[PDB]
């Protein structure tokens, strides 16, 4: 029912960034984090599949990691982000991902996907500047062998487009690595 993955890491400072009001934990995180592991067919994100109900007990052996790599960074409870992940995306793979492998899969897809670390050694790391949609793609094409899916958010008082997401994509076997084709960054944007 898929024939592509969309892993997408969310960068917390600035996803917070929008709460103009209340508490927002993602404030301060330093590091990419998990926004989710989507299952992709035509183009588009395929959503609530009929599976499995989530089970907490099938990833318990992961807790650490999901609660390092996978914390909500707008709320307080890391298992209703996983719970919600799974029910509206994990699903749709679960044909040939269990909901133990889907997870293992999310985590071993940000271990080897290190986006500051790609970034850092061509000045590209972030500081609240300017920076270019093609310079940003092509370092992290350069690193990781394809182009990755960059997405902004426009501040509605401002009108300044920020870098809120990076997205990685991958064939249907979930490991080898393809190009994203689309980007919601305009050519520059504040990271
Ligand atoms: N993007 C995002 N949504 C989160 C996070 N923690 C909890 N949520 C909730 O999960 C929803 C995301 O749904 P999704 O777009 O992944 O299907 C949000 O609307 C929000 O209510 C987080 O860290 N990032």
């Given at each position: 029912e898929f024939d592509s993955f969309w892993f997408v890491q969310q960068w917390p400072p600035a996803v917070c960034?929008?709460?103009?009001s209340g508490s927002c934990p993602?404030?301060?995180?330093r590091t990419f984090t998990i926004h989710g592991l989507w299952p992709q067919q035509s183009g588009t994100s395929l959503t609530?599949?009929?599976?499995?109900?989530?089970?907490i007990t099938k990833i318990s052996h992961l807790q650490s990691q999901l609660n390092t790599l996978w914390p909500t960074v707008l709320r307080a409870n890391n298992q209703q982000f996983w719970s919600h992940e799974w029910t509206k995306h994990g699903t749709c793979s679960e044909?040939?991902?269990n909901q133990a492998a889907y997870f293992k899969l999310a985590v071993d897809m940000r271990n080897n996907y290190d986006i500051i670390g790609a970034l850092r050694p061509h000045a590209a790391?972030?500081?609240?500047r300017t920076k270019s949609r093609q310079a940003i793609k092509g370092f992290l094409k350069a690193k990781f062998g394809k182009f990755p899916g960059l997405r902004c958010r426009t501040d509605?008082?401002?009108?300044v487009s920020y870098l809120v997401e990076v997205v990685a994509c991958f064939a249907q076997d979930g490991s080898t690595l393809i190009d994203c084709?689309?980007?919601?960054?305009?050519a520059n944007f504040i990271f």
């Open positions: 960034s929008f709460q103009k993602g404030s301060g995180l609530n599949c009929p599976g499995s109900p989530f089970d044909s040939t991902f790391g972030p500081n609240g509605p008082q401002t009108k084709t689309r980007d919601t960054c305009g």
